[PDB]
Amino acid sequence: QSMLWVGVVSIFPEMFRAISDYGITSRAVKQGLLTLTCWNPRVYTEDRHQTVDDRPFGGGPGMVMKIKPLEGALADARQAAGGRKAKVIYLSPQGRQLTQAGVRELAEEEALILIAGRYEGIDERFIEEHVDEEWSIGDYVLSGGELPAMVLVDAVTRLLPGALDGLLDCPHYTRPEVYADKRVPEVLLSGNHEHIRRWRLQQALGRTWERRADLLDSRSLSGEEQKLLAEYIRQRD
Amino acid sequence: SMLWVGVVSIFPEMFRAISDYGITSRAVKQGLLTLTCWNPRVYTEDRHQTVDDRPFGGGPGMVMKIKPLEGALADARQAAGGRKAKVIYLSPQGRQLTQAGVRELAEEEALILIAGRYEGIDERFIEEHVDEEWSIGDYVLSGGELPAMVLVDAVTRLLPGALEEDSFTDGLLDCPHYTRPEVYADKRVPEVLLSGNHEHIRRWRLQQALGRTWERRADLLDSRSLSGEEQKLLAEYIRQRD
Numbered sequence: 001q002s003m004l005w006v007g008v009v010s011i012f013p014e015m016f017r018a019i020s021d022y023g024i025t026s027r028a029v030k031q032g033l034l035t036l037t038c039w040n041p042r043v044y045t046e047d048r049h050q051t052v053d054d055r056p057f058g059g060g061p062g063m064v065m066k067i068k069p070l071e072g073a074l075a076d077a078r079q080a081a082g083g084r085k086a087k088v089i090y091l092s093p094q095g096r097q098l099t100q101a102g103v104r105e106l107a108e109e110e111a112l113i114l115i116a117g118r119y120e121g122i123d124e125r126f127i128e129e130h131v132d133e134e135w136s137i138g139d140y141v142l143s144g145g146e147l148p149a150m151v152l153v154d155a156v157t158r159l160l161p162g163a164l165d166g167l168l169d170c171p172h173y174t175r176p177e178v179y180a181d182k183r184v185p186e187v188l189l190s191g192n193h194e195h196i197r198r199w200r201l202q203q204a205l206g207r208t209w210e211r212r213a214d215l216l217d218s219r220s221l222s223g224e225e226q227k228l229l230a231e232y233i234r235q236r237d
Numbered sequence: 238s239m240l241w242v243g244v245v246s247i248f249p250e251m252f253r254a255i256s257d258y259g260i261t262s263r264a265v266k267q268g269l270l271t272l273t274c275w276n277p278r279v280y281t282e283d284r285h286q287t288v289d290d291r292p293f294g295g296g297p298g299m300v301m302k303i304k305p306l307e308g309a310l311a312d313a314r315q316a317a318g319g320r321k322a323k324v325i326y327l328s329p330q331g332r333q334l335t336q337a338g339v340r341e342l343a344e345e346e347a348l349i350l351i352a353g354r355y356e357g358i359d360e361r362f363i364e365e366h367v368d369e370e371w372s373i374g375d376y377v378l379s380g381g382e383l384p385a386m387v388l389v390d391a392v393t394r395l396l397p398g399a400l401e402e403d404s405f406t407d408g409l410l411d412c413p414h415y416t417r418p419e420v421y422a423d424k425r426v427p428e429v430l431l432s433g434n435h436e437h438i439r440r441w442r443l444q445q446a447l448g449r450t451w452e453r454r455a456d457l458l459d460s461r462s463l464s465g466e467e468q469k470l471l472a473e474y475i476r477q478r479d
């Protein structure tokens with residue numbers, strides 16, 4: 001069957017058409033590399049207008065997603081995963097910050113159940129009991145976990161065999177050779193494979209040093225890379 | 238509308254994820270947000286051209302051409318009218334998005350977002366037209382559509398009438414939340430939330446926020462220092478945690 005099974009618990013399963021119908025995620029679903037399923041907590045409640053949230057204990061603004069509707073959707077999702085070891089992830093701004101290293105780790109799992117919260121969040125007792133890991137996509141607050149869950153699925157899907165450094169990328173250029181007073185660097189126009197590979201690596205090193213030096217501190221630079229970086233720095237105005 | 242957003246993307250219909258659901262949908266209905274899309278594929282030189290061409294100097298993948306991006310941008314700039322529109326390219330090379338950045342972006346009257354695919358756009362388009370480059374985090378995605386939506390959602394939350402004290406607001410993670418029932422499967426709601434006054438609840442919530450930030454995101458504490466009262470609440474959380 002599929003290389004990676006993903007079950008999403010969300011009150012907006014339709015939002016997930018952004019990944020089921022587009023790009024590498026759509027391709028992986030078609031190619032059978034990825035199985036994507038949704039589980040609306042709104043169908044694991046017992047009322048006419050379908051409610052998932054209740055007021056927070058201790059007062060304050062907003063509402064909190066109840067334990068029962070989430071436990072419903074989770075149990076159903078766990079059953080459909082079958083004999084796969086499924087890691088339960090809650091998407092949250094309190095979680096561990098997602099990075100490419102984390103993406104690689106998540107890509108090694110055979111099944112993921114992603115919980116997309118809404119409102120002020122979900123009842124802490126649901127988290128303590130059922131959530132294996134909490135993950136954040138960045139230091140900003142969103143209205144729900146759906147876009148984060150999709151960002152996670154997209155990043156992980158890229159790493160699946162058949163779907164498709166610690167440095168920023170080099171600039172890219174395409175047709176035409178000259179466009180409104182701006183011209184393409186000559187090394188890409190007629191240079192050799194080593195001339196282009198050295199220029200691209202130097203531009204990548206240079207751009208990382210300018211904008212994301214923290215990425216260089218973590219990284220291990222070779223003698224050749226130290227020379228290309230030094231050169232980029234002393235040759236710019 | 239309070240905020241006008243134009244998105245430049247080869248997949249405008251992916252944006253139904255924000256135009257039809259959640260707070261972004263409500264803001265579009267309430268007229269607080271205007272959301273429009275601009276497909277570069279309809280701005281090619283001729284209908285037989287793709288948006289992308291092969292990269293100069295070889296290597297894997299394709300690169301989005303300047304000409305379609307420029308047509309989509311000029312058209313979006315015209316529809317923005319008399320609004321000062323900030324041009325944003327969503328990119329993993331950009332400035333990392335944070336709640337502080339979202340607040341700054343929320344003060345703009347118009348935004349024009351540029352979303353490219355996995356192989357990137359021509360540097361000359363960026364140099365010439367892009368006002369700001371923003372990344373949503375240190376991970377690699379297949380395109381800028383999900384990042385552009387993450388940005389619109391974060392900014393929309395700050396619009397008056399769309400929904401002030403949550404995670405990264407004051408440099409702290411949030412406290413845990415609890416709802417009905419009082420006891421669920423051998424687990425009970427903290428007593429202070431059932432029987433405490435407003436000051437008891439405030440100190441407990443602040444203490445939980447400080448302890449959770451100290452446990453998971455101590456970097457946030459380094460930036461945002463701690464007052465005397467907060468140091469005492471945190472010292473107490475640490476010694477009583479287990």
Ligand SMILES: NC1CCN(Cc2ccc(CNC(=O)c3csc4nc[nH]c(=O)c34)cc2)CC1
Nearest residue numbers: 327328329355356373374376377378380381384
């Ligand atoms: N063959 C090369 C491999 C690296 N590529 C760099 C690159 C360019 C664009 C993307 C697509 N990502 C985004 O558009 C994006 C936009 S915002 C964002 N934030 C975090 N991560 C992201 O990937 C993004 C991914 C990688 C260029 C082609």
Ligand SMILES: C[S@@+](CC[C@H](N)C(=O)[O-])C[C@H]1O[C@@H](n2cnc3c(N)ncnc32)[C@H](O)[C@@H]1O
Nearest residue numbers: 091092117121136137142144145148403404411
């Ligand atoms: C308004 S937020 C709740 C934020 C609140 N400060 C809390 O206690 O987590 C609603 C939901 O969106 C998701 N979410 C918000 N920002 C996120 C982020 N940066 N990363 C991951 N998920 C996020 C979570 O699933 C969260 O339950």
